Amino acid sequence: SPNLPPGFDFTDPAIYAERLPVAEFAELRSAAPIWWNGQDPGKGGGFHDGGFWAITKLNDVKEISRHSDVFSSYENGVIPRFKNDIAREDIEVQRFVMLNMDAPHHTRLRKIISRGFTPRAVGRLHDELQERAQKIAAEAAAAGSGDFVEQVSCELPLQAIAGLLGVPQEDRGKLFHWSNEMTGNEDPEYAHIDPKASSAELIGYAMKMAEEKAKNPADDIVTQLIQADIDGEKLSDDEFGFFVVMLAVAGNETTRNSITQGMMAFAEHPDQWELYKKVRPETAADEIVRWATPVTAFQRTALRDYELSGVQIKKGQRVVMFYRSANFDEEVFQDPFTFNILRNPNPHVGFGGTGAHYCIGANLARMTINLIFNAVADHMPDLKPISAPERLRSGWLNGIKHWQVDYTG
Numbered sequence: 405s406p407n408l409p410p411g412f413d414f415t416d417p418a419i420y421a422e423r424l425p426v427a428e429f430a431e432l433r434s435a436a437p438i439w440w441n442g443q444d445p446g447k448g449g450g451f452h453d454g455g456f457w458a459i460t461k462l463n464d465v466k467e468i469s470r471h472s473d474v475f476s477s478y479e480n481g482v483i484p485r486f487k488n489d490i491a492r493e494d495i496e497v498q499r500f501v502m503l504n505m506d507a508p509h510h511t512r513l514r515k516i517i518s519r520g521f522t523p524r525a526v527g528r529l530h531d532e533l534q535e536r537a538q539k540i541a542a543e544a545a546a547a548g549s550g551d552f553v554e555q556v557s558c559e560l561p562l563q564a565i566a567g568l569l570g571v572p573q574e575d576r577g578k579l580f581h582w583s584n585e586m587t588g589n590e591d592p593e594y595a596h597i598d599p600k601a602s603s604a605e606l607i608g609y610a611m612k613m614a615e616e617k618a619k620n621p622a623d624d625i626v627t628q629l630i631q632a633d634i635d636g637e638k639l640s641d642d643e644f645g646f647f648v649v650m651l652a653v654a655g656n657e658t659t660r661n662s663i664t665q666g667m668m669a670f671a672e673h674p675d676q677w678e679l680y681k682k683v684r685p686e687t688a689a690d691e692i693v694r695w696a697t698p699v700t701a702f703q704r705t706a707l708r709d710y711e712l713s714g715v716q717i718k719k720g721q722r723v724v725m726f727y728r729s730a731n732f733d734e735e736v737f738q739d740p741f742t743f744n745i746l747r748n749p750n751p752h753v754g755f756g757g758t759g760a761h762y763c764i765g766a767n768l769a770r771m772t773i774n775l776i777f778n779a780v781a782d783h784m785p786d787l788k789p790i791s792a793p794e795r796l797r798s799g800w801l802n803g804i805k806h807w808q809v810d811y812t813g
């Protein structure tokens with residue numbers, strides 16, 4: 405049996421508020437790479453099934469991710485932890501998010517939304533995003549010091565997703581705050597905010613945008629979605645609203661945490677920061693995503709009994725894929741605990757295990773990361789931290805809320 409504290413739960417948001425449980429994941433990969441993480445009644449983060457299988461090795465993450473015929477996103481959704489008292493209907497409403505759909509309906513909605521994330525569509529955004537990155541870093545730098553998360557990390561992904569959606573840059577703050585409220589609900593900084601109401605506020609905004617784009621269509625996702633046809637029928641209001649929920653959250657709660665944690669890594673590894681500033685290599689974004697693993701974990705539910713790496717998984721049981729563990733898998737990566745911005749091949753699973761749900765934003769994310777680090781290297785090459793990062797209290801999202809830095813060092 406692995407050497408862990410009795411009752412230890414790898415989805416416990418109390419851990420992530422303080423730290424990433426790196427030695428605990430390392431202990432599972434060594435001792436029990438697929439391991440039954442039991443959960444006491446009422447302590448299941450919204451699930452009441454006694455616990456789940458912790459999946460810690462990259463090969464097993466791929467096998468689950470790539471066989472969605474067996475491992476369902478729809479049955480319990482993919483988020484493995486909510487507040488302990490969330491109502492089951494409030495988990496099930498998240499089946500209106502494409503991330504939580506299975507084929508065939510998943511297939512139809514993904515085919516539509518992917519039309520706006522083609523490699524040449526993303527490549528067409530380069531100059532715009534570059535111009536924004538330089539402005540963001542110049543403005544942060546002129547302030548001398550401050551919160552890197554708010555001044556640097558959040559802006560470029562937030563502008564990017566607002567521009568893609570068709571949100572006027574003037575209302576971009578609204579998306580960001582609603583996304584933070586919906587994903588921060590277990591953190592004391594978001595105390596007294598009902599995430600259901602924040603979802604409803606964003607959805608209401610999305611419906612205002614749908615009326616705006618119905619009269620004034622434009623080259624943007626809201627226009628695309630309200631015009632979409634599935635075999636003759638428009639997206640339902642529920643699916644349209646939750647499309648914007650999903651996109652606002654993916655846009656505002658992933659890339660910014662890779663950027664904060666990439667800069668944390670560069671502060672800890674000055675060797676790699678000098679190399680980055682000189683060469684600006686095209687492999688840096690992927691090492692930043694491996695090192696940052698912005699999504700710690702997503703889950704699936706077995707639709708039939710299934711043998712995985714000698715372990716018998718039962719129909720109806722949850723498997724929780726710890727990307728944070730897989731991205732440090734000693735049998736995959738040469739020196740996983742070395743931050744190496746030249747690492748290649750780099751078969752990390754920051755964007756999941758591949759298969760039907762693979763991140764549609766991955767190339768956008770990598771562009772965003774490269775553009776913002778080039779701008780930070782240009783405008784604040786000697787930045788240094790002032791105090792420790794403040795981590796988000798979440799049992800699946802690996803967030804940095806705030807991080808005080810001196811842009812001058």
Ligand code: HEM
Nearest residue numbers: 503654655658659662754755756757761762763764765769
């Ligand atoms: C470094 C940044 C990002 C990370 C680490 C990340 C990570 C992920 C992960 C782990 C998944 C689940 C994949 C799976 O289950 O196989 C996913 C799905 C998805 N992501 Fe990303 N993401 C990032 C940025 C973005 C951005 C910027 C957007 C869009 C603007 C985006 C849009 C989506 C969408 C729509 C899905 C659902 C795809 C589906 O279910 O078919 N992501 N992402």
Ligand SMILES: CC(C)CCC[C@@H](C)[C@H]1CC[C@H]2[C@@H]3CCC4=CC(=O)CC[C@]4(C)[C@H]3CC[C@]12C
Nearest residue numbers: 494498501503586587599600603649650653654
């Ligand atoms: C990487 C991206 C694709 C991830 C996107 C995950 C999104 C869809 C998830 C993450 C947290 C989820 C929210 C959790 C809080 C919550 C409680 C409810 O009672 C209503 C639904 C909401 C408001 C959920 C809606 C769907 C959200 C916003």
